Amino acid sequence: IKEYADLKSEAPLIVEGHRPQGDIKFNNYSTRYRPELDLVLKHINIHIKPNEKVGIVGRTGAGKSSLTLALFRMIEASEGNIVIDNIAINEIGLYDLRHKLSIIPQDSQVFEGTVRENIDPINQYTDEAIWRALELSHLKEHVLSMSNDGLDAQLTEGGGNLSVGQRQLLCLARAMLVPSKILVLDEATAAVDVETDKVVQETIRTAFKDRTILTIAHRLNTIMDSDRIIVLDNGKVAEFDSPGQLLSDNKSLFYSLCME
């Protein structure tokens, strides 16, 4: 027990510096997936518009997954830094950093309890906010199917578990319930219900029409629908980021990926 009681913490949760829209600005940021591994991000300096919708693509093993971890400081930066809203990611403190942002993970999960608790464990949203978020996510209707408890209807890891593709919709519902200043997205590595995919893609853009959506894609269609796309490979941005100009003219690897 003391063996884990002695573990080195990831980072201080709260710091003196705190913020009061959005911003994403790499500043020669570079990072390795782990200290024992070589670098996975190399001197990125990209800047994203305050309400931009952007897409990240790459080959299998390109290292693009680490972008979310670095943006959430899940991995400490090997070099360089990032700034959001004129405040560095390190200064704000991890608690506030993760509270102000939002993200759909590669794999979402269900927690044993209630949907209301599994969506607002912090208990910081109004009941009308919860209802409106579930409705805008097109989730309240199927939520009411389980039991008369509605928002308080139970759920569990097994037996009382939801649809495998419904998990990602629920995570998106949580993200849209949160008043996020910035957002991120991800998709199932394996094949999933295209109905759920369309529902998520429609609702995310319809809700966060005024908030940033930087998405990581396993299918290039989301890159096509993104206002800006940057392809990443070998720990480096692989081309001049554009909405499809390189696909139109250069026939770049971005075009080859959409061909594939």
Which residues define the annotated binding site for ATP? 58-65
Angle at which helices 127-136 and 166-177 pack, to 10 degrees?
130
Reference 216, options 180, 247, 252, 189; nearest CA is 189
Binding residues: 58-65
* Separation in Å, CA 260 to CA 167, 217, 224, 250, 255: 28, 14, 14, 16, 9
